[PDB]
Each structure stands twice: as structure tokens, then as C-alpha cells.
Amino acid sequence: GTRVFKKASPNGKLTVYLGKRDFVDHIDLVDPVDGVVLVDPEYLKERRVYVTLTCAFRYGREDGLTFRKDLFVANVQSFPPAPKPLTRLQERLIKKLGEHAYPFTFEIPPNLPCSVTLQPGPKACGVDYEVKAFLAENLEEKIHKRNSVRLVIRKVQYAPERPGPQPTAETTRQFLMSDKPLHLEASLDKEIYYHGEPISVNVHVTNNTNKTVKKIKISVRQYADIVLFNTAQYKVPVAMEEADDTVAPSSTFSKVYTLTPFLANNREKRGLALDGKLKHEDTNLASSTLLREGANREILGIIVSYKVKVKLVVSRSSDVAVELPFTLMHPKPKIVFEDFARQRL
């Protein structure tokens, strides 16, 4: 039936239940983090149960950190209940789990960065979301690790396909020791693409020169800018098609090329922004960072964007190129207990 993900604290006395691992950001709002926390009463002994949701930017090795910045923290006291309406899943889970199952809910602000991990090779950085449930007498009391449970949830970006005009074409005019120019014009089929979806690139060349285009290189490039702790810029090709298609002198050429950027091909590449850990199978290339008008760019930690590049290799050699921006999003999303740990393949 309904899949519910759970994780227990090391001692087994505190257990957290969530409906999903990935909470979709719909730009306007984010899926609520609706969960339940079960507690052992003999072990409770008149202690409070807290649940914390943290969004943090981290920089440095996973394995005392080098850098960590909390971008958002939300705390809720689940036991005793604090002076909110429950969801279908929470109501269904309390009935099944019993009188010691207490609800927790967080509303993730939409302006926060989506989950992103940047692998720089043999160091790392990223934005992570963590649900932490723990039992204690107050927030000021230092927590015992066996009395706490940590679940790494993700915020993933989804945007609906653009209802409007076609994506604008990119052009370039270049003179190649010539009286008249070579005109390169390219366009993409859509503005928004999802992970695993092919990208079609409509290439148009009006070569009014006496030179010949010997080949056409089509590629998808990821651009990842680190904007916290250590300002840096990465550029990684994530898809490449080298076509041996020529454009004769004084001639017009037109062709549609299709490419699909896949993480599977770029596991070895460095400076690559992913939407999760490389070890987890549900990880894809990072989605494009949506920049709202007047938003603080710095507090997003890592800014990801994509472009398709169309390069014409000319004989003499020389290069004529255009770059086409596009948005890469997470695909449209979609009682038995399951472990929260994400699978590797």
C-alpha cells in the first residue's frame, strides 16, 4: 500500500516515520515535512521529545568539520504536545503505532536552496536537509547520541513545462577571411527538461563564405558556482556529440541533433553538482538553481546552470559557436514500512 520510511535511534527507544525521502519544491510552495515520532514509555522517564529540521551548507571532507552554515533551523516539541492540523498519513500512522506516536510537521521555506552535493575529486561541499528527533529535558541540555535519530531528507526542484512562446534562438555572425559571413543559429525544443529527458537542438547554418565547416560539436555543459566559504566556478561537459557533418561553401545547412545529459556517464568527472550523494542510486545531476528576482544569491551556497553549446569546426582551424540556456528539473514526482537508508546500485 502506502510506503512509509522509518529510522530508529541507536538504542531503539526513538523512531521517526516519514512518508517520503524527497520533498518537492513547486517554486510557490514546498511539500510539508509531515512525520511521526514513536517513543518507548519505560525509557521516557518524564523527558521531552524534540524534532529539529536543519538546512545547512557544508564545506570540507565528510570523513569536527571545516565549515558549516545553518541556512534554516525549525524546532518542534513533539512530547508533551505544544499549545496544527494532522495529515492523512500522520492520522493513519498514529492509529497503527499507538498512543506513544506523536506528530511533527515542518514547512520548508521555498526560497531555500534545493539539496545539492558538489564532488570535486580527490574538499566537497553542498546543501543538506536533516530531520533530527531526540529526547531531552530542554534544548539547552547537550544531547546523547543514542537518544537521537538523524534522517537526511532532500528538497528537490520541480517546475511545470512552460505554457507560452518557443525558447528564443541563439545566433552568431562571423567573418572567416570573407566578404560575407557564416551565420550559425540554434534553438532548443523546450525551456524546461527533466532528468533523463532528451534535448533536441535545431541547428541552422547559412555559410556565405568560401570556407567549409568540417564538423559540428553539440554538448551540454553544467556550470556550478560555489558562493559560500570558498568562491569558485566549475564548468563540466555532461553530454557530447561530435557530428562529422559538413557545411559546404556558399550553402545553407539545417539539422536536429539530440543529446541526453546522464549522470551515469559522468560518475568519474570532478566539479560536478549532483542533487544527492554519488553513492545513492536516486541521485541525478543537480537541478538548475532557480534565482528569484532580488534574491540573495550567496545564501544558496551553490548556483547550478546548464547550457547546450553548438560549435562549428571550420577548415583553414577556427570555431563558430552559440550557447543555449535551458532549465534542468527533477521529474514530476511519481501501509508497508521501509528503511530510510537510500539504496546504492
UniProtKB/Swiss-Prot annotation:
Impact reported for residue 342 to A: Abolishes interaction with AP2B1
UniProt entry keywords in alphabetical sequence: Cell membrane, Cell projection, Coated pit, Cytoplasm, Cytoplasmic vesicle, Membrane, Nucleus, Phosphoprotein, Protein transport, Signal transduction inhibitor, Transcription, Transcription regulation, Transport, Ubl conjugation
UniProt keyword Glycoprotein, yes or no: no
Interaction with CHRM2, as annotated region: 41-78
Posttranslational mods: At the plasma membrane, is rapidly dephosphorylated, a process that is required for clathrin binding and ADRB2 endocytosis but not for ADRB2 binding and desensitization. Once internalized, is rephosphorylated.
Family membership: Belongs to the arrestin family.
Protein name, UniProt field: Beta-arrestin-1
Organism: Homo sapiens
Gene: ARRB1
